Design a binder for this molecule. Structure first.
Ligand SMILES: [Cl-]
Ligand SMILES: [Cl-]
Ligand SMILES: [Cl-]
Ligand SMILES: [Cl-]
Ligand SMILES: [Cu+]
Ligand SMILES: [Cu+]
Lengths: 309, 313
């Protein structure tokens, strides 16, 4: 043999601890190796999300009190309800969705990045608390929580995704994980961007932009990992998974439209919020490596809302 | 009829998502409420660990190159091996241990705090990589990974804890979760502090102190939550769980002693490393609400080493 291999590489005869815990005990465990990185995209994402660390205490929400006080009681209630709705989706993602992805990682660094995502989506949920602490009465806060618990249209959306997280199909779990930052919160994010475009709650929209700076990377990353895994399947299994993605998005769009109509119809924002939602549904499909089937007309966003985005 | 409830509060007729996911789908989900906090200890812990956010890039490890170059290949190999061993334990805790705690939380905020722990223990593991990048050859780094995979005494320790994380007993899972930051890494932390007490690798010891600033809160918090849950058991079942804690710690001390003898005997550090380990075994039990059964002599630490430990980050 012209190539003498005296030792066998440690990496190919060991498993990460999470693999050992849940899947394969046939070999000993390897420590994470940050010196020999399998996918440089992992290091790029790790560096960006850790460099982007923030806490809601960094933003002076107190400065929004004047513009908040200009808003009628029904608008204040709409914002508190919408944001408590987004708090629920962040609680789902932080406590179930992100941590479920860790054991299904392609790489060692991916396990640590999803730990960062779980923590930072927790910070997202905590930030709404900070906004409420500054702007809302105890009565407004308590009412919003009651409204969320009793809103069947709102509950339907996380109830549809959670089963994919707790089941044993890692690709369907990954699609659910991408759908949360990629699609489900944009219907809600429409409201602060609408308000900011008209000069209301500027400091609140600064928190929303810090949340979105994280969520756009979360969607990209989960989509990137989905694409690497699905590419290794047969043409038939790739066709079945593409069908599953479109079928699940179709269902979630149906549930989102029902919820957004209920949330916004009284205010005249439902049509605009749904177009904003469908635009992001298109970007969600693109980040999974599929083509958007959505029309220019049904995805149209006002320039000044896009500007806030 | 004086006491009839006409209005049921949202909290007591809903569940957190993680409860809905793993335990009960009969009730609708509530969003986390940071405006009405059940346990003020959760907010204090959240505020401290988030305020204590750090990255290993923050510490100029390259300033250790002079003192690193003074150490012979045997000492450099010992440090790379020990630290890759600590990297393995941090990987176990970040990817399995902390994650496993979330669904067993007593409060909403506890679910988010364990997400923070999973991330920050990930940062701990990443910090050894930063030290290696700066100080070690590619040969030293690869050798240490091979050594960790093939070291049965090293492997035995995490292999003993992982089953508690993957099993359905949340109190045993919690004890394991406290044992990792409370006890299992201190045998390894002895080495950097031994060296920095003699003015070697001072910047490395700053990284270890930033890691310890997190791990002491992790141990306290998991111990605090253990004590709240064990208090809800019958006195009979409280006695059983106390016996399990002492039996598990006894077993883990056995495995740690074997590993530290194998790691250090050649460098004459084994006895002092084990004393340092048992000192922290004592602190671990105290944080679970039990008395340390260890003597002053069994737990003696040289004052110059204790000065490196107790020094604030
Ligand atoms: Cl998200
Ligand atoms: Cl995410
Ligand atoms: Cl730890
Ligand atoms: Cl921990
Ligand atoms: Cu996210
Ligand atoms: Cu820890």
């Amino acid at each position: 043999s012209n190539i003498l291999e005296m030792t066998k590489n440690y990496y190919d005869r060991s498993v990460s601890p999470v693999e050992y815990a849940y899947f394969d005990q046939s070999q000993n465990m390897r420590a994470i190796n940050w010196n020999k990185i399998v996918d440089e995209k992992d290091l790029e994402v790790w560096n960006r999300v850790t460099q982007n660390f923030w806490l809601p205490e960094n933003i002076p929400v107190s400065n929004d009190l004047p513009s908040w006080n200009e808003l009628d009681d029904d608008w204040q209630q709409l914002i508190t309800r919408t944001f408590t709705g987004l708090t629920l989706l962040d609680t789902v993602q932080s406590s179930i969705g992100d941590v479920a992805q860790i054991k299904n990682s392609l790489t060692e660094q991916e396990q640590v990045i999803y730990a960062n995502f779980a923590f930072m989506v927790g910070v997202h949920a905590r930030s709404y608390g900070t906004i409420f602490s500054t702007l809302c009465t105890s009565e407004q806060i308590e009412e919003a929580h009651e409204w969320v618990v009793d809103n069947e249209a709102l509950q339907a959306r996380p109830k549809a995704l959670i089963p994919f997280y707790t089941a044993d199909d890692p690709l369907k779990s990954k699609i659910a994980a991408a759908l949360m930052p990629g699609f489900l919160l944009y219907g809600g994010f429409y409201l602060p961007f609408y308000l900011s475009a008209r000069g209301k709650l500027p400091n609140t929209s600064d928190i929303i932009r810090l949340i979105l700076r994280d969520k756009v990377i979360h969607n990209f990353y989960s989509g990137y990992k989905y694409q690497l895994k699905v590419a290794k399947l047969s043409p038939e299994k790739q066709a079945e998974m593409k069908q599953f993605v479109f079928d699940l998005l179709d269902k979630m769009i149906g549930l989102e439209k029902t919820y957004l109509h209920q949330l916004y119809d009284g205010f005249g924002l439902a049509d605009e919020a749904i177009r904003f939602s469908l635009y992001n549904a298109g970007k969600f499909l693109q980040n999974l490596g599929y083509e958007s089937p959505f029309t220019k007309e049904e995805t149209r966003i006002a320039p000044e809302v896009f500007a806030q985005l």
